[PDB]
Amino acid sequence: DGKNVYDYIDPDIDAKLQALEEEEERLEKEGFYDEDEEEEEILQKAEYIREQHALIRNEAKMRKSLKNRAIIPRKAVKKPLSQLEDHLDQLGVDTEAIGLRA
Amino acid sequence: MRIENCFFCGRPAWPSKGITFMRNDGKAFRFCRSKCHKNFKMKRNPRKLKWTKAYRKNAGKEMVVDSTLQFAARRNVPVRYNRELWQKTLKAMERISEIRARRERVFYKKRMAGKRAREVAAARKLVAENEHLLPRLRGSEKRRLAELAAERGDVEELEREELAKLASKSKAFGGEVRR
Amino acid sequence: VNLRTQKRLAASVLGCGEGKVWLDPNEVSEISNANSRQSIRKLVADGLIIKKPVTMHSRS
Amino acid sequence: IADVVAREYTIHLHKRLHGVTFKKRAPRAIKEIKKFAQKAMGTSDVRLDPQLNKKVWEQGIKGVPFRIRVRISRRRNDEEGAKEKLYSYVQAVNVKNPKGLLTSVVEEE
Amino acid sequence: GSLAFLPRKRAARHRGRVKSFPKDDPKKPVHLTAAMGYKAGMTTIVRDLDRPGAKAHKKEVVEAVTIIDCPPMVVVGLVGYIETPRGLRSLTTVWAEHLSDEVKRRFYKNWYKSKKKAFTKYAKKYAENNGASITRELERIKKYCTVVRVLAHTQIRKTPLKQKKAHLMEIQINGGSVADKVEFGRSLFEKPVTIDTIFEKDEMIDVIAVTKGHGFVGVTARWGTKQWTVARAGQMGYHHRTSVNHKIYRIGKGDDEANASTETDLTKKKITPMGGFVRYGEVNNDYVMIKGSVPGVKKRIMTLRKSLFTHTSRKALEKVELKWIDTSSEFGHGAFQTAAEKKQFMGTLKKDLQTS
RNA sequence: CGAAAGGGUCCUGUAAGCAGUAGAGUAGCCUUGUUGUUACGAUCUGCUGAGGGUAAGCCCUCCUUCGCCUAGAUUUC
RNA sequence: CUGUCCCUAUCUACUAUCUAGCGAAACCACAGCCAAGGGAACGGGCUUGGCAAAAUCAGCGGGGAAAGAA
Ligand SMILES: [Zn+2]
Numbered sequence: 037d038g039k040n041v042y043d044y045i046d047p048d049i050d051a052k053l054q055a056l057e058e059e060e061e062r063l064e065k066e067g068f069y070d071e072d073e074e075e076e077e078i079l080q081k082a083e084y085i086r087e088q089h090a091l092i093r094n095e096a097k098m099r100k101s102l103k104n105r106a107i108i109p110r111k112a113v114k115k116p117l118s119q120l121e122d123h124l125d126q127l128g129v130d131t132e133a134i135g136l137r138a
Numbered sequence: 139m140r141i142e143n144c145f146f147c148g149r150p151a152w153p154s155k156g157i158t159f160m161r162n163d164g165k166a167f168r169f170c171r172s173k174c175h176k177n178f179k180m181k182r183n184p185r186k187l188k189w190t191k192a193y194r195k196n197a198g199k200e201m202v203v204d205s206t207l208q209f210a211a212r213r214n215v216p217v218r219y220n221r222e223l224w225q226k227t228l229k230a231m232e233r234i235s236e237i238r239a240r241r242e243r244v245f246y247k248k249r250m251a252g253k254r255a256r257e258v259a260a261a262r263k264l265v266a267e268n269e270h271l272l273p274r275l276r277g278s279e280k281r282r283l284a285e286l287a288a289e290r291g292d293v294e295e296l297e298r299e300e301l302a303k304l305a306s307k308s309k310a311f312g313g314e315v316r317r
Numbered sequence: 318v319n320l321r322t323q324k325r326l327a328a329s330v331l332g333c334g335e336g337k338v339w340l341d342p343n344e345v346s347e348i349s350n351a352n353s354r355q356s357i358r359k360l361v362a363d364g365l366i367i368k369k370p371v372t373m374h375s376r377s
Numbered sequence: 378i379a380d381v382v383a384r385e386y387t388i389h390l391h392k393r394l395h396g397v398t399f400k401k402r403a404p405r406a407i408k409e410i411k412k413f414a415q416k417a418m419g420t421s422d423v424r425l426d427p428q429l430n431k432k433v434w435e436q437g438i439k440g441v442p443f444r445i446r447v448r449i450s451r452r453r454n455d456e457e458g459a460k461e462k463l464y465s466y467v468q469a470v471n472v473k474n475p476k477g478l479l480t481s482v483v484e485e486e
Numbered sequence: 487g488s489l490a491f492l493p494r495k496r497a498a499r500h501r502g503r504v505k506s507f508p509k510d511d512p513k514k515p516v517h518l519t520a521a522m523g524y525k526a527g528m529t530t531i532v533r534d535l536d537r538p539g540a541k542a543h544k545k546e547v548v549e550a551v552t553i554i555d556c557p558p559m560v561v562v563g564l565v566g567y568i569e570t571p572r573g574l575r576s577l578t579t580v581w582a583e584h585l586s587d588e589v590k591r592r593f594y595k596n597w598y599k600s601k602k603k604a605f606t607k608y609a610k611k612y613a614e615n616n617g618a619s620i621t622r623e624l625e626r627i628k629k630y631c632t633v634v635r636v637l638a639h640t641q642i643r644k645t646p647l648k649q650k651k652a653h654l655m656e657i658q659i660n661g662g663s664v665a666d667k668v669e670f671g672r673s674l675f676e677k678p679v680t681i682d683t684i685f686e687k688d689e690m691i692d693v694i695a696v697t698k699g700h701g702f703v704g705v706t707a708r709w710g711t712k713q714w715t716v717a718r719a720g721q722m723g724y725h726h727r728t729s730v731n732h733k734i735y736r737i738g739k740g741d742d743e744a745n746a747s748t749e750t751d752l753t754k755k756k757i758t759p760m761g762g763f764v765r766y767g768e769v770n771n772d773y774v775m776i777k778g779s780v781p782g783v784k785k786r787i788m789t790l791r792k793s794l795f796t797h798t799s800r801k802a803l804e805k806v807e808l809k810w811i812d813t814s815s816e817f818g819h820g821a822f823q824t825a826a827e828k829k830q831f832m833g834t835l836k837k838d839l840q841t842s
Numbered sequence: 843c844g845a846a847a848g849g850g851u852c853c854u855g856u857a858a859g860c861a862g863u864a865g866a867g868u869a870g871c872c873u874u875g876u877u878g879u880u881a882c883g884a885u886c887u888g889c890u891g892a893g894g895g896u897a898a899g900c901c902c903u904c905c906u907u908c909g910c911c912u913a914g915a916u917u918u919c
Numbered sequence: 920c921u922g923u924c925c926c927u928a929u930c931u932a933c934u935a936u937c938u939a940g941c942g943a944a945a946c947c948a949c950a951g952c953c954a955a956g957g958g959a960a961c962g963g964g965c966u967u968g969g970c971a972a973a974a975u976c977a978g979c980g981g982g983g984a985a986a987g988a989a
Contacts, residue, residue, distance in 0.1 A: 037235065037753060038150055038827040040141055043210055044234070045227050047217055053230055056205060060237065069244060075258050081272055082261035088271045090473040091309070098311065098428070102437070106369040108339060114364075125277035139532060139546055139750075139809060149821045149831070152814065154530045154548040171819040173853095189855055189891060199891085200833065228752065239830055246834045256889070260860065308385075310448055311428040311469040317456075384908070387846055395898035417845070417909070443895080480846055480908040599912085646901095702978080719978050761851035762901035817900055818852035825850075836892065 144170035146177060146184045148191030201245045206238045273305055318349040323366075326357050331368045341365040380463060383450035384482050387475055388413050391443040399439040406433050406441045414467050418451045422464040429469040446475040448483060487709040487717065497726035501787050502694045505728070507658040508794050510633070514661030516670045520791035521684045522640050522653055523554035523774060525695075525782050526763045530812035531735070531775075537804065546809065551735060552780045553757060554788055557644040557771040558678030562589060563637025564671040565656055566627030577631050580623050581605065582675040583612055588652035589639045597651075627668050634659050634667045636674065646767035653787050681772050682737045685790065690802040692730045694789035695782035699724030727781040730793070735806045736775040745773065746811035753810075755824055761815040775811075 046052065063069060121131050142151040151170040159167040159175075169175040177187065184192045194200045201207065209230075217223075265272070279300065287293040320340060327338045340348050344365045351357050360366045393409040394402050407425065410433070414423045433441060447467055454464040472478065507519050531549050535542045562585055568577045590604045591597045612620060627634065635656035642649050659667040685691060700707075700723035709717040738745035738757055745756045757775070758768045766784045774790065782788060797803070814820035822828040 037231070038141060038823060038831070039231055039235070041224065041227055041231070042140070043212060044231050045213065045217060045223070046209075047223070049223075049226065049230060052209070053233070056209075056234070056237065059205065069240070075254070075261075078258065078261045078265060082264040084273060085264050085268045085271050087473050089268075091471050094471050097435075098432070104372050106337070106372050108367060108369065112364065112367050126274075128274050128277055128280070130277055130281070150827075152812075152821060152823075153532055153546075154812075155814070155819075155821065170821055173819070187855085194891080197887090235830065242833050246839065250839065250889085253889075256861075263860090309471045311432070311471065312426045313468070314466055386908085389846085389898085391895085392898045413845080419910085477847075479906085482908075704978095705980095713981085716980075718980085759851090759901095764900055765897095767901060815851050815900095817896095820852075828851095832891075836890075 142168050146174035209234055323348050326354055327366045330354050333368050337369045339367040339369055381452050385448045388445050390441050402441045403434050403438045414449050414465050418465040420463050420465040422461045424466050426468045432469045444475045446470055446472045496724045497696045502696055502726050502789055510660045512662050516662040516667055519658045523556040523788045524645050525784050525786050526553040526555050526766045526769050528552045532809045534807045551775045554774045555769045555771055556681040556774055557641040558680055559638045559640055560678050561636050561638050561674045565635045566631035567633040569632050591651040628665045636671050647785050688806055690731050690733045692791050693780045694728045697725045697727045697781040698783050729781050733777040738773040740771045748808045751810045755813055759813055759816050761817050764816045
């Protein structure tokens with residue numbers, strides 16, 4: 037198993053072995069090897085926050101473009117009621133407020 | 139035949155595997171591969187490069203003091219062949235190997251003891267200063283619930299029930315333009 | 318529809334380059350129907366022909 | 378089974394663009410995405426979103442990402458006597474990391 | 487270049503033919519001549535040499551060996567030949583019960599769309615008491631034939647390749663009377679033959695294959711340069727070759743679970759490298775590990791046959807004392823024989839801690 | 843059979859971010875500092891043989907997931 | 920060190936298989952497989968031998984080019 041019998045051969049090796057198992061028994065007796073909800077949910081919340089950060093970074097880099105392209109201003113472009121209502125109720129906005137508008 | 143150890147990195151230098159270099163001082167440099175050979179020829183320091191056993195034992199990433207580690211040694215005064223001695227040596231090899239593995243597991247865990255504390259503290263900070271990005275409900279949902287909770291006689295539990303259901307259960311880019 | 322004429326007239330009336338004039342993709346039919354510098358001014362007022370801002374040239 | 382169906386895939390553009398000429402990695406990536414959708418949904422009429430095109434061309438012509446996560450939706454093409462009855466529209470989906478995601482069918486409801 | 491291998495045409499058939507079987511004399515016992523296999527790759531061995539007269543005597547020498555996976559070979563036919571003024575002629579052939587789907591795939595080209603109707607009337611010719619006809623064919627072989635061969639096919643189903651089509655060949659029977667060898671073949675119908683029953687250890691043999699193709703290659707690499715004897719440009723490679731005198735060092739049983747173990751390294755491991763044979767896979771069957779290189783690409787069909795003549799070198803009489811077998815990854819500059827060795831060397835990892 | 847995924851194997855060399863008065867240095871508070879404070883901060887260490895890539899001519903798959911399939915065109919004793 | 924050679928680096932110039940479409944020119948008696956003989960350092964058709972099987976693709980290093988004589 038990748039080990040040299042020549043390196044590990046030693047006369048009077050029974051004493052060394054017996055010392056080794058005696059030391060092990062001491063170690064388990066002592067506790068050298070004794071293995072010992074809110075945290076899970078807070079970690080889950082943090083992971084969701086990180087996912088949202090990645091998503092918003094992806095949207096930003098998606099809209100960014102590479103080298104200084106002149107873009108149409110928001111006040112010039114027009115946006116649909118479906119998109120506005122969707123975004124608002126994703127943030128949690130009651131939608132009977134909008135509807136007449138334009 | 140002997141399983142040599144690479145001078146630069148320490149992985150087993152098996153026969154027919156690698157190149158050895160002979161300095162004029164009179165002692166030989168055995169390398170296990172071309173990576174190690176080229177690194178030594180460029181005179182980089184194995185004690186400094188972080189993929190070497192030298193770095194692991196200098197930064198304390200591997201145990202250096204253990205009776206399991208003093209069983210291993212090159213032997214300079216040879217012994218006579220003895221069948222029972224060799225067989226008991228084989229069995230001792232097995233026992234020492236499993237003991238070393240299990241103590242190595244303990245060493246790794248004792249080193250990487252504190253992980254949950256730091257991760258959970260980072261989670262508290264992330265939640266505390268990113269309160270607004272936490273899983274929200276949805277207007278139509280909240281509204282709908284109110285009607286169904288009115289039907290079933292409960293609003294609060296119905297909320298934190300579906301808040302879970304939806305959390306247990308991605309956005310595309312753009313959409314079809316009508317032709 | 319071919320809108321080279323509308324592009325040129327819109328640039329001329331807006332006092333900008335042909336790379337700075339923007340025609341509404343959804344209203345190519347109305348832009349094509351517009352073929353005078355009064356109709357193109359009407360479209361500019363209505364928001365279908367838009368002059369883009371200058372490219373960012375941050376100096377800091 | 379259904380004629381109209383949307384399913385989410387991951388494409389190993391690294392595997393389909395190993396060795397390709399640097400000034401062609403992006404157009405060959407578009408062609409390979411088209412062929413992948415054609416094989417997956419069995420439709421010769423494949424249309425890629427302009428935002429998918431920008432996603433492919435994000436890092437220039439020679440900087441095509443290794444793996445892309447897309448959603449392919451096969452719908453009916455009504456038109457008027459069209460040569461094919463079904464067409465596949467391919468969109469890019471916003472994912473934290475395009476690894477570890479299996480193929481999943483997305484629900485319209 | 488060479489004026490012997492000059493029609494530098496590509497081999498007409500991908501399998502390769504024996505073209506010469508060892509001369510037959512009835513005094514020897516009844517035996518088969520050749521076998522097949524599939525190339526897997528090469529590994530490294532060290533051998534305690536016992537060669538009087540060489541400076542490498544009583545020492546360890548690093549040596550290169552090649553692996554050929556050889557699953558058991560199914561015997562399905564017997565061909566009887568007659569001797570005529572125009573040469574050898576196939577008098578007649580006798581097949582067997584229940585030819586396998588792999589040999590039927592060999593018979594067909596478009597197997598998927600075909601109605602798999604091969605040897606149906608032959609199966610009826612057995613099962614419907616026309617055993618009289620089959621026996622009369624056997625007695626015709628016994629009475630009129632002088633050279634008898636056995637139709638044998640390999641098991642691609644066991645060999646780890648995408649292919650599913652078997653490989654038939656005629657393996658000559660030697661050492662006995664025609665009646666004795668016909669009885670041998672008939673008794674050998676529908677039973678696999680094992681490579682340790684065809685060859686054994688330390689026997690210098692001959693390997694027939696098709697050497698790798700390179701396409702249209704210029705004279706610089708075609709002839710090693712700085713009428714028909716002038717170096718020309720054309721097809722180099724994909725050439726039928728019969729390389730002689732290759733000592734088989736080991737026959738691994740496949741099911742031993744310790745195929746790569748020698749008496750000096752008590753390591754329970756198989757021949758398959760750590761991570762598998764590159765571009766081939768795993769050798770899970772009986773394997774032939776042979777000294778030196780062998781013509782052909784990995785996973786290519788091979789033909790292993792006995793030497794046509796008795797040997798003249800001490801090299802064939804030599805016994806081989808293996809010491810260790812290389813198992814490290816061929817996918818790069820590996821250094822670990824087993825996953826257990828790698829784990830013990832590198833300790834535990836972040837993924838191990840997170841999984842456990 | 844195909845695409846993903848998981849594991850194995852090989853290549854590189856220790857990711858982003860955070861923390862420790864470890865940290866050479868840069869400045870304010872009040873008065874003397876014998877241990878004064880408050881902020882910024884190269885660099886270091888830990889998290890981390892981690893992160894990234896892995897067949898395009900690598901390997902394996904127990905229900906690892908999803909999909910496909912008995913075609914359509916020609917010719918022949 | 921050199922009025923010497925070769926290799927590496929850079930620049931300049933010429934260097935390119937198949938499919939869709941477009942699409943010449945040079946040159947052309949008719950042809951084109953070899954060996955011996957065909958007095959006139961002459962053979963490509965003749966004698967008599969070798970032989971000799973449709974239709975094509977690519978490579979090409981051979982032939983289809985040479986004197987006139989004091
Ligand atoms: Zn090394």
